[PDB]
C-alpha cells in the first residue's frame, strides 16, 4: 500500500530519496547525495505493485534517475530494482544498474552494478 | 554436448578463450584480448556441470580470470556465468562481473556487469 512507501528514506552512503506513491502504481520524487542542499537534487520516476500479495511478501518496485539537473549533467542514468518490506523498521532492499553514455568501442564497460538498503525516516 | 566445451572460442569483440573440460567438472585454460600478442594471455580456472539434464537443456558453467600475468597487473578479476548449448552452431552464452580492488570510499563503484556470447567462429 502506498502510504508505507511514501516518505523520506536514506541509504547506507547517506543519500536521500523523497518519494510519493500514487494509487495507480506511480512513484515520483527526488534523489539527493549526502552533500545535501539543492544540487544534488534530481527527478525520479518509477512504478510499484499497488496490490501486493498478502503473507510477509515484500512489495516489488523500481525507479530511474537520469543524472542531469539544471546545474550538472553526468550523462548517465541509474535504475534501482527491489522490494519494500514493511514492519516497525521499514526497509527498501535494492540492486541497481548505473549506465554511462559511451562511444561504441567502450560500450562493453558502460554499466556498473551494486546494491542499496534504504531505511525510512519521515512520511 | 559435455566435452564439446573443449576447444577454442571467440567472443564478439575478438577475445579468444581456449578451454580443456575435465571429465569430473574442471575447466582450465587461457583467455587473451584481441591485438593478439602472447601476453594479453591470462590463466583461467572454472567448473561446469559434468552430467547435465537429458531434456534439451544447456550445460551450466562458470570461470574466473584474475588480471595479472608476468607483464601486467590490472588489480581486478572477472567471473563469467552462463551455459553451453551444443548443436550445429555451438555457443556459450554468458553474463560477467568485473570487480576492481578499490579503497573503501570507492567500493560502491567497484563492479561492472556485462554479457558475452562465445562461438567457435
Amino acid at each position: 500500500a502506498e502510504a508505507g512507501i511514501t516518505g523520506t528514506w536514506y541509504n547506507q552512503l547517506g543519500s536521500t530519496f523523497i518519494v510519493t506513491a500514487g494509487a495507480d502504481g506511480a512513484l515520483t520524487g527526488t534523489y539527493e547525495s549526502a552533500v545535501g542542499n539543492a544540487e544534488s537534487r534530481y527527478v525520479l520516476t518509477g512504478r510499484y505493485d499497488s496490490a501486493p500479495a498478502t503473507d510477509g511478501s515484500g512489495t516489488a518496485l523500481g525507479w530511474t534517475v537520469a543524472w542531469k539537473n539544471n546545474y550538472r549533467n553526468a550523462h548517465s542514468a541509474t535504475t534501482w530494482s527491489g522490494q519494500y518490506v514493511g514492519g516497525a523498521e521499514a526497509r527498501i532492499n535494492t540492486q541497481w544498474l548505473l549506465t554511462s553514455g559511451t562511444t561504441e568501442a567502450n560500450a562493453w564497460k558502460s554499466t556498473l552494478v551494486g546494491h542499496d538498503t534504504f531505511t525510512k525516516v519521515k512520511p | 554436448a559435455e566435452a564439446g566445451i573443449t576447444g577454442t572460442w571467440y567472443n564478439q569483440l575478438g577475445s579468444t578463450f581456449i578451454v580443456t573440460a575435465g571429465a569430473d567438472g574442471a575447466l582450465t585454460g587461457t583467455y587473451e584480448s584481441a591485438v593478439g600478442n602472447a601476453e594479453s594471455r591470462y590463466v583461467l580456472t572454472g567448473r561446469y556441470d559434468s552430467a547435465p539434464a537429458t531434456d534439451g537443456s544447456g550445460t551450466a558453467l562458470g570461470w574466473t580470470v584474475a588480471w595479472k600475468n608476468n607483464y601486467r597487473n590490472a588489480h581486478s578479476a572477472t567471473t563469467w556465468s552462463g551455459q553451453y548449448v551444443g548443436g550445429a552452431e555451438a555457443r556459450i552464452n554468458t553474463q560477467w562481473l568485473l570487480t576492481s580492488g578499490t579503497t573503501e570510499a570507492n567500493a560502491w563503484k567497484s563492479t561492472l556487469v556485462g554479457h558475452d556470447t562465445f562461438t567457435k567462429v
Binding site: 552512503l13 547517506g14 543519500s15 547525495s33 549526502a34 552533500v35 544534488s40 534530481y42 534517475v65 543524472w67 550538472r72 553526468a74 548517465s76 541509474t78 548505473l98 | 560502491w108 563503484k109
Partner: peptide, 6 residues
C-alpha cells in the same frame, strides 16, 4: 566523481 554517491 559520480553524483549517485559521495
Amino acid at each position: 566523481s559520480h553524483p549517485q554517491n559521495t
